[PDB]
Design a protein around this ligand. Structure first.
Ligand SMILES: *[C@@H]1O[C@H](CO)[C@@H](O[C@@H]2O[C@H](CO)[C@@H](O)[C@H](O)[C@H]2NC(C)=O)[C@H](O)[C@H]1NC(C)=O
Ligand SMILES: *[C@@H]1O[C@H](CO)[C@@H](O[C@@H]2O[C@H](CO)[C@@H](O)[C@H](O)[C@H]2NC(C)=O)[C@H](O)[C@H]1NC(C)=O
Ligand SMILES: *[C@@H]1O[C@H](CO)[C@@H](O[C@@H]2O[C@H](CO)[C@@H](O)[C@H](O)[C@H]2NC(C)=O)[C@H](O)[C@H]1NC(C)=O
Ligand SMILES: *[C@@H]1O[C@H](CO)[C@@H](O[C@@H]2O[C@H](CO)[C@@H](O)[C@H](O)[C@H]2NC(C)=O)[C@H](O)[C@H]1NC(C)=O
Ligand code: NAG
Ligand code: NAG
Ligand code: NAG
Ligand code: NAG
Ligand code: NAG
Ligand code: NAG
Ligand code: NAG
Ligand code: NAG
Ligand code: NAG
Ligand code: NAG
Ligand code: NAG
Ligand code: NAG
Lengths: 149, 427, 99, 248, 179
């Protein structure tokens, strides 16, 4: 009537009353990541590898107006701005993503109620670019030579 | 002909993070109350692992800085159009670059390497996404992460590292030539071959054989990751070592350490609070000991990984982006050049080299004493006697040529075991 | 506190309900009828009964026999109350006075 | 194992097992008329220390194109008198009758094949008074089976019995509290008329090996059947197999 | 490390002064043993950390010895070892627990667009290659320029390397017999 594994746990059973067979799985367990910038009233929160549907239905029932889904997991209390790129980051969330902080200023105080945390792209290194060709132009190559130093 | 071989150097490893009180005392409140009177034991373990992961991120940015230092690309560069220079096909080496592709790909050599390795950096993320259900029933990674053991992603994704190596490989091919000494790729090949003792007439007349030997070695590199490649065994040893360490750490939650049971559920359903404490204490001590030993081992392995990363940075600087006058540094002697590709937890270098095939036995002299009691010695070659005339040949290809001042180094005197050759006042 | 990324302590999803299963209409163990049987054995030929597939409680068992002392070992008394076991073996004998 | 199922896995399990590389011993005896007294001697009257494992042949006699199953009965005990309890396992052509009583056992006992009866009468006890019995039960086995397998052991005053008629791994039959220690067993001679080589070419076989508590590695397949086992202390290959918890 | 003298390690107190003023010698040993084991474990962990940091320190010190020997006290023909490329020289200063290196580098400011050739095919079907620089066409005549400063100048025998053949994509120029 009981199904075991080699470590000694019960992983399934068959009911004495109904002759129905079931398996057992454990309940979900995990932690939260908090990206916190100094002199703020709250952190931004990341639920790693979780959907926001699961987060709002099975984890927390408290008030959270801002939430979205990212490749890293569910982000609460931050703004989805991953079209904008940043080269120096002190809240680096993993796999190329950053949390930026920008409080609304005196004159740059947008009246729409948002979060000062943004979820942006981390990209530290770059190439230099030139506006010259990649092939021969009449046999000769186009190149950029210094004239002063 | 031109030979080629590949070599994997390991620059990182999976970043393990550990929830200490979740590992020791998973959900049970009496265990947590007992663990509170051990002081700062769990905070120290967390701090050591965070220091290790900071070191891993520093070395990752150093590798990425070596790949991108001083490279200037044309903004007209579009690798859906530009994948061939001088009859050498670099199509399987480049990912995507250009303002009309969207940098969201690997090269196919990277794809062959990254599909035989299941638990890469993106494999961990997409495996942990399936842990609300197991996606069939169950998985070992979900059991580990419910017991407080997770692998964190690195701070740069692997498509960014692939973009770095793509820009490095394409800086050698195209008219700024920031990685091929400011001269084109075939010209740089001919100069590095000519610097071994091979004359430039042979290399001007055998240009297509050089290109075809390059393409042949590249295609045999690509069709070679098949179950006996040593660099693939090098790559998979990293993943198997990480999996064995984490599974043997998870097996510590089923030792009794001298208690009556290895389960807190069983002790808390059979005993009283003054009697369950003595049994819970032994499980606490054994699990904290196992965590301490794991933390010491990770601390000693990060030093090996940093030594390997510094060697890989030196190879990118002095083998891939330039070519040193050091002999037997990259490759083995008769080394021509190197390329780099992104591998799981490291880099993969391709070394091209000169390879002789057939031979001829020559009688040679190292020096000629001319009349006036002067001397000449050959400049990377030997002196030979052909048809009773003295001639020069390079040391790595048999090709006689007239003795001129570009083959010799003069001396106002001459050595005693030079051969006397008074007939010589030639060109 | 300083600017940083902080990993906070662990949550578990809270259990909504209880599933509770028992077998209905099982016999009574009648441990009191054998404990209060008339013929009492010596310690030399002590007696054993096995009780399985039944229903018991310790309240009626401890108020139907006249208890001097009820100690337990490797178990706690309050852990018996909602429990199920595979069997209960009850040995009985009379106690000599000097021993 | 008792009410557990294991599925496509290896398991390290300590139990009451035989020793890989030891010997069986065919203790079956057949007679027709005479009974030698050396048939009842300590070569054949063996010891029951922790238990026995035994492999039994089901001899299939034929009368009128109708099957008859037959093998030798076993008796377990300590002194084999009517002041101590003895266990008797006796087959009755598809019915295995197992009794634990205070028997008054005969000095030179035997049984008789019932399909083609023998010269003598069956005589292993004489008791018209129906003695005290701790246990009395009837089990049914597959008549068409070739091999039957039996585990018999003791532990802390309790006697345990496992059996199989389909396949080699056994399943639990019965347990019985005794409070004493059993110390001998004996397989009885089955006296028959037509079993030998001048008749239909049949044979009695009853092979016994001792049992002890030891650790095996077991292999459970997808339906939960034991398919392979290895004794962890029989060779060097088995040590590699148990320390790696692998069969290859 | 100093904070470990206030952990209890599962005992009744973290002070030996409190334990030795409340208990008998047989009963106090059980409490003291837990403190002794926890403190020795904390020391062993500190020693492991120091053993791991001295390896990174030795690797960095060997890199500093290399840079003193081959960027300050001489200059090696390696590129990208000291500095970044376009590196000129280094100086060294003493810093707390290390050395401070000052690297000087050729930094270009303004640039120019030129059309260059990588090698010429002279009559007799001989070939010349430019020595660290390019062949540019100035006033419809071939000249040489170095790669890191634009300065046209005559094609001579000190700007080239000579070949008795010429490669297939080289530029044909019969009008050169110059110095
Ligand atoms: C579950 O399966 C068991 C099989 O063991 C069923 O028990 C059988 O019930 C029938 C009719 O009630 C009897 O004829 C059999 O003798 C029983 N078997 C045994 C071994 O006792 C049981 O009825 C099933 N339950 C349900 C709800 O279907
Ligand atoms: C108390 O125990 C004795 C045995 O020690 C019980 O006697 C049995 O009684 C039944 C009839 O009810 C007989 O069939 C048994 O053979 C008796 N056994 C013995 C060993 O004599 C007695 O019944 C018990 N008392 C009660 C109230 O049940
Ligand atoms: C505890 O056990 C006693 C028996 O020792 C149970 O008492 C029986 O209760 C049922 C109905 O509740 C009666 O029909 C029986 O006659 C009772 N027997 C005796 C000997 O008193 C009691 O029910 C049990 N407690 C609970 C909560 O069920
Ligand atoms: C087990 O089965 C056997 C065979 O069916 C039963 O043995 C027979 O029992 C009847 C009734 O007492 C006797 O008349 C026969 O002589 C017995 N046969 C033999 C060959 O001796 C036996 O009674 C059954 N056991 C139980 C406990 O019911
Ligand atoms: C911001 O934090 C700093 C801590 O370094 C503190 O000194 C300062 O007063 C804070 N500013 C405000 C406006 O709270
Ligand atoms: C965040 O913004 C990007 C770009 O605007 C978009 O592609 C992405 O879908 C957004 N995220 C969500 C959850 O909508
Ligand atoms: C390239 O990266 C650097 C990093 O400092 C950044 O400043 C620069 O703006 C980037 N280039 C472009 C075109 O965005
Ligand atoms: C520079 O590039 C832009 C497009 O990026 C192009 O329109 C322009 O003509 C280029 N300038 C020169 C001088 O070639
Ligand atoms: C180079 O720059 C310096 C400083 O700006 C200036 O004085 C000088 O005239 C420049 N030379 C040329 C050739 O442009
Ligand atoms: C020479 O250049 C042409 C383009 O001008 C190219 O098609 C050809 O492949 C080149 N050949 C070699 C050997 O470089
Ligand atoms: C996760 O599960 C989905 C469906 O359950 C499956 O398609 C996918 O391949 C799984 N991925 C991993 C890494 O297990
Ligand atoms: C058999 O066991 C292996 C263990 O690796 C497992 O992968 C496989 O799914 C099992 N087969 C079945 C039918 O359960
Ligand atoms: C077998 O068959 C014969 C002939 O029909 C009959 O005489 C005999 O009694 C049968 N045997 C038994 C045991 O009934
Ligand atoms: C066996 O018993 C029966 C009836 O008691 C009797 O007819 C027969 O002669 C007996 N056989 C022997 C050998 O005593
Ligand atoms: C066991 O019994 C069943 C049905 O009685 C039969 O199909 C099977 O063949 C028997 N086993 C053997 C080994 O004959
Ligand atoms: C028994 O075996 C012998 C082999 O020597 C054979 O000759 C005889 O016919 C067999 N008889 C039967 C009934 O099988």
């Amino acid at each position: 009537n009981l199904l075991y594994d080699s470590n000694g746990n019960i992983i399934g059973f068959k009911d004495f009353l109904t002759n129905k067979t079931y398996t057992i799985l454990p309940c979900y367990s995990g932690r939260v990541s908090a990206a916190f910038y100094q002199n703020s009233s709250s952190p931004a929160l990341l639920y790693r590898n979780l959907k926001c549907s699961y987060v709002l239905n099975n984890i927390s029932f408290i008030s959270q107006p801002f939430y979205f889904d990212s490749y890293l997991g569910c982000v609460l209390n931050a703004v989805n701005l991953t079209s904008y790129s940043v080269s120096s980051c002190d809240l680096r969330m993993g796999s190329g993503f950053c949390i930026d902080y920008a409080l609304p200023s005196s004159g740059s105080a947008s009246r729409g109620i948002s979060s000062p945390y943004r979820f942006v792209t981390f990209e530290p290194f770059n190439v230099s670019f030139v506006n010259d060709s990649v092939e021969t132009v009449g046999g000769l190559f186009e190149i950029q030579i210094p004239t002063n130093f | 002909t031109i030979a080629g071989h590949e070599e994997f150097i390991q620059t990182s490893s999976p970043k393990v993070t550990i929830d200490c009180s979740a590992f020791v005392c998973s959900n049970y409140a009496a265990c947590h109350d007992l663990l509170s009177e051990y002081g700062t034991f769990c905070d120290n373990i967390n701090s050591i692992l965070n220091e290790v992961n900071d070191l891993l991120d520093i070395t990752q940015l150093q590798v990425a800085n070596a790949l991108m230092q001083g490279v200037t690309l044309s903004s007209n560069l579009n690798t859906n159009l530009h994948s061939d220079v001088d009859n050498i096909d670099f199509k399987s080496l480049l990912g995507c670059l250009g303002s009309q592709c969207g940098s969201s790909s690997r090269s196919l050599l990277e794809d062959l390497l990254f599909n035989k390795v299941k638990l890469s950096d993106v494999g961990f993320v997409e495996a942990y996404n399936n842990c609300t259900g197991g996606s069939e029933i169950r998985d070992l990674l979900c059991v580990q992460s419910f017991n407080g053991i997770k692998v964190l992603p690195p701070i740069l994704s692997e498509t960014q590292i692939s973009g770095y190596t793509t820009a490095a490989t394409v800086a050698a091919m195209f008219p700024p030539w920031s990685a091929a000494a400011g001269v084109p790729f075939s010209l740089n090949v001919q100069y590095r071959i000519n610097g071994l003792g091979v004359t430039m007439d042979v290399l001007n007349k055998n240009q297509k054989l050089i290109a075809n030997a390059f393409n042949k070695a590249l295609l045999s590199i690509q069709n070679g990751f098949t179950a006996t490649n040593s660099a693939l065994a090098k790559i998979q040893s990293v993943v198997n070592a990480n999996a064995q360490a984490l599974n043997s750490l998870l097996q510590q939650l089923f030792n009794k350490f001298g208690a009556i049971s290895s389960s807190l559920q069983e002790i808390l359903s059979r005993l009283d609070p003054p009697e369950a404490q003595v049994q819970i204490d032994r499980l606490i001590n054994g699990r904290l000991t196992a965590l301490n030993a794991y933390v010491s081992q990770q601390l000693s392995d990060i030093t090996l990984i940093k030594a390997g990363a510094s060697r890989a940075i030196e190879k990118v600087n002095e083998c891939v982006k330039s070519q040193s006058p050091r002999i037997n540094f990259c490759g083995n002697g008769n080394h021509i050049l190197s390329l780099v590709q992104n591998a799981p937890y490291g880099l993969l270098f391709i070394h091209f080299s000169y390879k002789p095939t057939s031979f001829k036995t020559v009688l040679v002299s190292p020096g000629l004493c001319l009349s006036g009691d002067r001397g000449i010695a050959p400049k990377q070659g030997y002196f030979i006697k052909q048809n009773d005339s003295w001639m020069f040949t390079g040391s790595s290809y048999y090709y006689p040529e007239p003795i001129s001042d570009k083959n010799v180094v003069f001396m106002n005197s001459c050595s005693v075991n030079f051969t006397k050759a008074p007939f010589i006042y030639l060109n | 506190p300083n600017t940083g990324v902080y990993d906070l302590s662990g949550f578990t999803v809270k259990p909504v309900a209880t599933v509770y299963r028992r077998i209905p209409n099982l016999p009574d163990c009648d441990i009191d009828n054998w404990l209060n049987n008339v013929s009492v054995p010596s310690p030399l030929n002590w007696e054993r009964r096995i009780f399985s597939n039944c229903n018991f409680n310790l309240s009626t068992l401890l108020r139907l026999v006249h208890v001097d002392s009820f100690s337990c070992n490797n178990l706690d008394k309050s852990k018996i109350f909602g429990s199920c076991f595979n069997s209960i073996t009850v040995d009985k004998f009379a106690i000599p006075n000097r021993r | 194992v008792l009410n557990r199922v294991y599925l496509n896995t290896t398991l390290l399990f300590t139990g009451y097992f035989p020793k890989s590389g030891a010997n069986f011993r065919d203790l079956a005896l057949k007679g027709s008329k005479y009974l030698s007294t050396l048939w009842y001697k300590p070569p054949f009257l063996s010891d029951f220390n922790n238990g026995i494992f035994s492999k039994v042949k089901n001899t299939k006699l034929y009368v009128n194109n109708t099957l008859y199953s037959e093998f030798s009965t076993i008796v377990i005990g300590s002194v084999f008198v009517n002041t101590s309890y003895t266990i008797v396992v006796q087959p009755h052509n598809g019915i295995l009758e197992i009794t634990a009583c205070q028997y008054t056992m005969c000095e030179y006992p035997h049984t008789v094949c019932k399909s083609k009866g023998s010269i003598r009468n069956e005589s292993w006890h004489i008791d018209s008074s129906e003695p005290l019995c701790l246990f009395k039960k009837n089990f049914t086995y597959n008549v068409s089976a070739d091999w039957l397998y039996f585990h018999f052991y003791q532990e802390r005053g309790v006697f345990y019995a496992y059996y199989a008629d389909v396949g080699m791994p056994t399943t639990f039959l019965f347990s019985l509290y005794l409070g004493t220690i059993l110390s001998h067993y004996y397989v009885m001679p089955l006296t028959c008329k037509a079993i030998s080589s001048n008749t239909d070419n049949e044979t009695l076989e009853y092979w016994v090996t001792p049992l002890s508590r030891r650790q095996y590695l077991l292999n459970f397949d997808e339906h939960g059947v034991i398919t392979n086992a290895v004794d962890c202390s029989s060779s060097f290959l088995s040590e590699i197999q148990c320390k790696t918890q692998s069969f290859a």
